[PDB]
Amino acid sequence: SKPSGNYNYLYRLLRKSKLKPFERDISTEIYQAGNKPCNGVAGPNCYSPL
Amino acid sequence: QVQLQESGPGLVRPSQTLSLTCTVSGGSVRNEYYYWSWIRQPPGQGLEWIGYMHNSGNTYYNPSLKSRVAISVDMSKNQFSLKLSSVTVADTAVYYCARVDVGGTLVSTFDHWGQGILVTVSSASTKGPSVFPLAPSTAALGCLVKDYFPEPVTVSWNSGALVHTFPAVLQSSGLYSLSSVVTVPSSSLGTQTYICNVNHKPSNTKVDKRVE
Amino acid sequence: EFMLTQPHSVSESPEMTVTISCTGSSGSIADNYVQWYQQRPGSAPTTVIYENYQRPSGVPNRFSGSIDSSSNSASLTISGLKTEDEADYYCQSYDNSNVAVFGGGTQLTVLGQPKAAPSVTLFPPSSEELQANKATLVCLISDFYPGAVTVAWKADSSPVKAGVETTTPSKQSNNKYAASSYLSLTPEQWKSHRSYSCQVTHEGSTVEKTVAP
């Protein structure tokens, strides 16, 4: 714990498919929640998982 | 835990045979007490059952398209395949794998579903869209972009100045129609210079149209 | 052929209780199991009520299933709505010929913001559109929170069924839903017919607006 806030610990969220047991993901590509994928920066329903 | 995963071509054309196969992990496809089904869900409609198959070879089909479906099972690779026949432009949907429980006294829920695969049926391969103005009648006016082949859509209003672009749907002809619109406080504001530009992603072709 | 019919849209304020029911027409509801699958938009369905009385582990106890043999229907009681309960619920059963019967689908949502009356933006074909030998009559309906997106087409005297290409409920940038009622008609039909109507009927309120040349 640090007073200036922690920015070196992150966690992936909202993966399109559930992982298998004993599996790690490294790619930090954004996740598409809707039906319109984003190619550049994140946006509505196309946020970043980290 | 047990999980499923679709596998197959994500884009086909009519007068062909839609072939798919689901790779099963965490469990053997040769295990009884379970059927291996295929569920269809068109975009915007409910679920539709295609058929489940027992490992003993007993394949149960849906009476709607029983004459145009075929299911197989392979105990070695733990993968069961789906094979339709005479596909049409209306057969495009999101196909989900599912394992039904045939354990106790009756058939029961699809306990484990796959991630779902979205495939489209279209015989075309390259087609440029066409823009059309939209005159208003607080008012609403925009542009009409129709008959574009690729799935990704590039919408630009006032070169970026903002929007609910109305995502298109697979029509009867196997194409899409974009109808992105904007709003104005009065008819006097519609006389200003408003531009609606679209970009053909696989071709890098830009289209311009003056609307007012 | 055994079938299952359930309401198209259900909406109620949070902390209250909703009820989604599916009624079997061409057969019995007690001869086969009935299952409810909560399908979140953009993900695969997931079982929340199976064997007509059982809920899987991990699913919150807010869900409960029931069977009515006198009315030949199967209901789903959800008490204490939450923000993640805005998914679709599908009632599925089996026919006597071992045919899986799926329901029509019910869109459930919590009433976060107050409900607003929908808007109608009937647009006739454009000049260049008419030059392209196409009509492309659209109804860019907007300004409605609940997911009760319905489209009922109607000509001057006759109903319209062919060419309906209504899209899924899409949310605007101001946190509000809006849809489009596409329609493709022959220009000869547009020249012969007098006018058409685009009935919305959102949340019972039959909002209707016509368009004429």
From Swiss-Prot, chain A:
Region (Receptor-binding motif): 1-50
Assembly information from the UniProt record: Binds to host ACE2. RBD also interacts with the N-linked glycan on 'Asn-90' of ACE2. Cleavage of S generates a polybasic C-terminal sequence on S1 that binds to host Neuropilin-1 (NRP1) and Neuropilin-2 (NRP2) receptors. Interacts with host integrin alpha-5/beta-1 (ITGA5:ITGB1) and with ACE2 in complex with integrin alpha-5/beta-1 (ITGA5:ITGB1). May interact via cytoplasmic c-terminus with M protein. May interact (via N-terminus) with host bilirubin and biliverdin, thereby preventing antibody binding to the SARS-CoV-2 spike NTD via an allosteric mechanism.
Disulfide bond positions: C38-C46
Region (Immunodominant HLA epitope recognized by the CD8+): 6-14
Disordered: annotated segments: 13-48
Function, in words: Attaches the virion to the cell membrane by interacting with host receptor, initiating the infection. The major receptor is host ACE2. When S2/S2' has been cleaved, binding to the receptor triggers direct fusion at the cell membrane. When S2/S2' has not been cleaved, binding to the receptor results in internalization of the virus by endocytosis using host TFRC and GRM2 and leading to fusion of the virion membrane with the host endosomal membrane. Alternatively, may use NRP1/NRP2 and integrin as entry receptors.
Mutagenesis / variant outcome for changing Y11F: Decreased HLA binding to NF9 epitope. Increased binding affinity to human ACE2
Residue range from the parent sequence: 443 to 492 of 1273
Name of this chain's protein: Spike protein S1
